[PDB]
Amino acid sequence: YRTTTGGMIRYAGVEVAKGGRKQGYEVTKGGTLLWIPEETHEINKDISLLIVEDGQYVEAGTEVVKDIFCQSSGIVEVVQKNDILREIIIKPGDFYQDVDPGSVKIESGQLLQPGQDVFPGVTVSTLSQAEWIESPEGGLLLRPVEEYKVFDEPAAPSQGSQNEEGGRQIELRSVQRLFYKDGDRVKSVEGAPLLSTQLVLEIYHLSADIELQDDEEEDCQRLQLVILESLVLRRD
Amino acid sequence: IRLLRAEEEIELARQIADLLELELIRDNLTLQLERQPSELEWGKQNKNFAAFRRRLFLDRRAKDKMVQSNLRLVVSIAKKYMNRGLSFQDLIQEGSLGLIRAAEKFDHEKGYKFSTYATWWIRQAIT
């Protein structure tokens, strides 16, 4: 769950429940997950600083665009609104020669199976996504997707407490939390984590606790999320 | 005063660069028009004279907008100089004279930000 570059994300049959779109979103069940990567560059340069065209395949040797070194390899795409560059969309993947551009536009939203073919005469190794570009003198591009395995519940250890459990009981829960939804892509080019196997507690809006390193069975340190109150004692 | 974005510094620099060629024509014409080019408009060569004053007012407002909005950069630089000889009041007025000179010599074709180039001119006018 540590990709090289950013890109879009879309789940398939994964339900979620959240209360805020800032601090992630707690997942409920499992399911498959897709990831369509694309490198972005939110800059504010001019047009005369651009040395490439709209749909020029670059390599990983130098990859200098708008006097800025890139890290990926694919089809570049610039965004111009008012003579100022706004975003440099770089879509990685393989470039293959093809014809009949009126049929590759309808395959932009369908999942291309690896057992089938994208064109008669052109083969593909694994599953990808068809996309056509508007380059001078022309073929469409194939953007591969990445799949991962997520669990509905991770490996949680056995919790142990020593109390009467009368009116005050604490425990520890290990849940997974996703940060992005299906209808939103990330504006990043470096490594962005997708989830975080955290440890969220639920006391069953006050009574703060203090943890320390206390251990007596072995010669090591052990965490103890305990809660204590200091009582007064006069030295008299 | 609200600060400028990264795309608004490029837009305002084009009208300042349009003001640089407008004052260069007047500086070349004042040596042969008896130093009084009030109505001598060489850029147009009732509708053309009104559009010339509209472009002159809009270009002077762009230079008015770039120096006035970047006044927080002068305070962040002059606060490190208010112990040697001068008070804090005289350093912002002298630092604002360098912000005016940085707005004329700012070249947006190089691609650098305005806060990178104006730091060299505010610190020069303070020193």
UniProtKB/Swiss-Prot annotation, chain A:
Family: Belongs to the RNA polymerase beta' chain family. RpoC2 subfamily.
Subunit structure: In cyanobacteria the RNAP catalytic core is composed of 2 alpha, 1 beta, 1 beta', 1 gamma and 1 omega subunit. When a sigma factor is associated with the core the holoenzyme is formed, which can initiate transcription.
Stated role: DNA-dependent RNA polymerase catalyzes the transcription of DNA into RNA using the four ribonucleoside triphosphates as substrates.
Protein name: DNA-directed RNA polymerase subunit beta'
Lineage summary: Bacteria, Bacillati, Cyanobacteriota, Cyanophyceae, Synechococcales
This protein's encoding gene: rpoC2
Whole-protein coverage range: 583 to 827 of 1317
UniProtKB/Swiss-Prot annotation, chain B:
Residue range from the parent sequence: 83 to 254 of 425
Subunit relationships: Interacts transiently with the RNA polymerase catalytic core.
Principal localisation: cytoplasm
Function per UniProt: Sigma factors are initiation factors that promote the attachment of RNA polymerase to specific initiation sites and are then released. This sigma factor is the primary sigma factor during exponential growth.
Cellular-component GO terms for this entry: cytoplasm
Protein name, per record: RNA polymerase sigma factor SigA
Gene symbol of the encoding locus: sigA
Region (Sigma-70 factor domain-2): 66-127
Keyword entries, A-Z: Cytoplasm, DNA-binding, Sigma factor, Transcription, Transcription regulation
Family as reported in the entry's similarity comment: Belongs to the sigma-70 factor family. RpoD/SigA subfamily.
GO terms, molecular function: DNA binding; sigma factor activity
Motif Interaction with polymerase core subunit RpoC, residue numbers: 90-93
Lineage: Bacteria, Bacillati, Cyanobacteriota, Cyanophyceae, Synechococcales
